[PDB]
Amino acid sequence: HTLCRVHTVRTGKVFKSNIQLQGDPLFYAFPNTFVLKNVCKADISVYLGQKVFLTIDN
Amino acid sequence: FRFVTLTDTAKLKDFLKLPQTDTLEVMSVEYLWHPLEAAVLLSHCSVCTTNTRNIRIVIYSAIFQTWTLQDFELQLPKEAILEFRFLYSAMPDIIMWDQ
Predict the structure, then answer these.
(1) Would you call A42 helix, strand, or coil by DSSP?
(2) Is B49 helix (H, G, I), strand (E, B) or coil?
C-alpha cells in the first residue's frame, strides 16, 4: 500500500505439471540474502539465500 | 465460405498432454490484434462430474501453424456462457464476460 505495491509472478503452473527436483539444491552459506546482478545483461541475475535462483529473465 | 477444419478437441488433448477421456470443450474463438493469430477458449475439468470448470486459452498462430498454451487460471461454474474480446494492444490482453 505505502511505498511499493505487491504482485506475484507465477507461470507454467496452469496445468498440474510434475517435474521433480534433481540433485541437491545449493544454499548460500551466509545468513543474509543477496542478489548478484550480471553487470552487462541486466536480465540475468542470481538470488543467493536459502535457495539459489539463476534467472535469465528479470 | 469454402473451408476446412482447423482443429478438434482430440488433437488439443494430445497437444496439451491431457490424459484423454477428459471433458474438453470450446467456449469461444476470437481473433486477437495480430493479423494472423487466433485464441480459442477451452473448458476442462478432467471428468470432474462437478459444476466447477477450469477455463484455459490456447493461441493458434497461422504463420507457424503452432498452438501454444497460455497462463490463464480462471475457474467458472459449468452453467456459465463465456464471451471474450481482445483489447487494442500488442500483447494479448482480454476482457471476458459470463452474463
Answers:
(1) coil
(2) coil
B54-78 burial, b for 16+ CB within 10 Å, e for fewer?
A: bbbbbbbeeeeeeeebeebeeebee
Q: Resolution to 1 decimal, in Å? A: 2.9
d(CA B50, CA B64): 37
Residue of chain A whose Cα is closest to the Cα of B18: A15
Q: Which of B48, B97, B53 is nearest to B73 (CA)?
A: B53
8 Å CB contact between B42 and B25: yes
Best of B71, B72, B74 to disrupt the A interface (most A CBs within 10 Å) is B71
Q: How far is CA A46 from the centre of its chain?
A: 7
Q: Residue B33's beta-bridge partner residues?
A: none
Enumerate the residues of chain B whose CB falls inside 8 A of the CB of residue A11: 71
**From the CA of A12, how many Å to the nearest CA of chain B?**
7
Longest dimension (CA), chain A: 41
Give the residue among B14, B58, B96 at the shortest CA–CA distance from A14: B58
Is B16's CB within 8 Å of A11's CB? no
- Positive/negative CA dihedral, B49, B50, B51, B55: negative
Q: Chain A residues with CB-CB distance to B under 8 A? A: 11-12, 14-15
